């Protein structure tokens, strides 16, 4: 007598790394980096009209 079980293949996903600038919704904002935001207390921007 000869018997055996088997494994056939092993399949995975690939998580798509998505840079935000790959989108063109980033036209709608000017996205600039603070290295520090949590220590700031005053968040006012001057507008000249």
């Amino acid at each position: 007598d000869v018997e055996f079980d088997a494994l056939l293949g092993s399949y995975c996903n690939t998580l798509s790394l998505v840079r935000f600038l790959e989108l063109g919704l980033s036209v709608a904002c000017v996205c600039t980096k603070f290295p520090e935001l949590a220590y700031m207390n005053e968040g006012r921007v001057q507008f000249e009209v």
Binding site: V27, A28, C29, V30, C31, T32, K33, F34, P35, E36, L37, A38, G43, V45, F47, V49
Partner: protein
């Protein structure tokens, strides 16, 4: 009498009396955004690393503070509404039971006061299963299965028999008067002047002073059931679509500049909740960004409705060929944003 009117509504007899019906519906709709180039400035921070030892494990919680600057002077972005997916609320029939309410004092004789409470709750859908706890919120029994959606809560308001139905064929208030704060001018008492001053007529109806004498006046029967201060509900978790209208303290604290009041109904906190089985008051931590045309204008929209089922069938031909009146019966064709839709 509250005992006596039980008898005449079971045997089909019409007492000298009238009603309005108020209920709230929720639609899930698709939208379209648009925004010109630099509509907003965006600042993102530098992320932190954190550690938290629990339950045979170590949590790393990565957090990062990020900020927002609306660079535009004026309106830079538009929500465009589009086709409707689902009437999530079923357009059904529910009588609201004030036996969940617990606020109002009962009548004296416990032979009679219990005789109503057995004969109203049993076997009503919305009636309490176990009688109401001393402090807490009472519960509505679990329905074994759901058909279309959550069943909206109809409400009933005492109105005269002899209003013109033409007041209802176009959009209006369940209240007999209009409300603020859009209609008000610039004076300290203007919000309450629109509410309860009856030497002056209504804004939206300059033909007369009111539409409902039993509402829209101080200590009216329409108000003292449904005023937010007076607390005849609150033990009831079931919603009340009248609460958005008859609470005078809510309108009096409203912002009044139409530069800003448009945006607030672009995203407003609903009073309703989706995953709730029937309509229920919102839990304190969940807030859904919901567009509310009923929020600003203080109006509600009439549906296609009639009293003959025969004369109702003239409406499905179209708008024009529906007859409106026949000797006592009547039709109300809808005035709604959903007018020409398939729903």
């Amino acid at each position: 009498s509250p005992v006596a009117l039980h008898h005449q509504l079971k045997t089909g007899l019409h007492p000298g009396f009238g009603f309005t019906v108020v209920r709230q519906d929720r639609f899930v709709t698709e939208n379209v955004l648009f925004s010109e180039r630099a509509s907003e400035a965006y600042f993102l921070g530098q992320l932190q690393v954190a550690r938290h030892e629990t339950g045979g494990g170590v949590n790393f919680t990565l957090t990062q503070p990020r900020g927002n600057v609306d660079l535009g002077v004026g309106y830079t972005a538009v929500v465009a509404t589009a086709t409707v997916r689902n009437p999530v609320t079923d357009m059904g029939n529910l009588p609201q039971n004030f036996y969940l309410g617990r606020g109002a004092p009962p009548l004296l004789d416990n032979a009679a006061a219990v005789y109503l409470r057995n004969a109203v709750v049993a076997g009503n859908r919305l009636g309490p299963a176990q009688p109401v706890p001393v402090f807490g919120c009472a519960q509505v029994p679990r329905r074994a299965g759901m058909d279309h959606g959550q069943d909206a809560v109809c409400e009933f308001i005492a109105t005269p028999v002899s209003t013109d139905v033409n007041y209802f064929r176009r959009p209006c208030n369940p209240r007999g008067r209009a409300a603020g704060g859009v209609y008000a001018g610039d004076k300290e008492g203007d919000v309450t002047a629109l509410m309860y001053d009856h030497g002056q007529s209504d804004p939206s109806r300059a033909f007369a002073a009111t539409a409902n004498p039993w509402a829209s006046q101080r200590f009216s029967y329409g108000d003292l059931l449904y005023n937010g201060a007076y607390h005849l509900n609150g033990a009831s978790p079931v919603l009340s679509p009248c609460f958005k209208f008859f609470t005078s303290a809510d309108i009096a604290a409203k912002h009044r500049c139409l530069e800003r009041l448009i945006v607030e109904t672009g995203s407003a906190v609903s009073t309703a909740t989706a995953a709730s089985d029937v309509q229920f008051k919102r839990p304190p931590g969940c807030r859904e960004l919901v567009e509310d045309p009923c929020g600003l204008f203080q109006e509600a929209y009439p549906l296609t409705c009639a009293s003959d089922p025969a004369l109702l069938r003239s409406a499905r031909n179209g708008e024009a060929h529906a007859r409106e009146t026949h000797f006592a019966q009547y039709l109300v064709y809808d005035a709604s944003p959903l007018k020409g839709l398939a729903l």
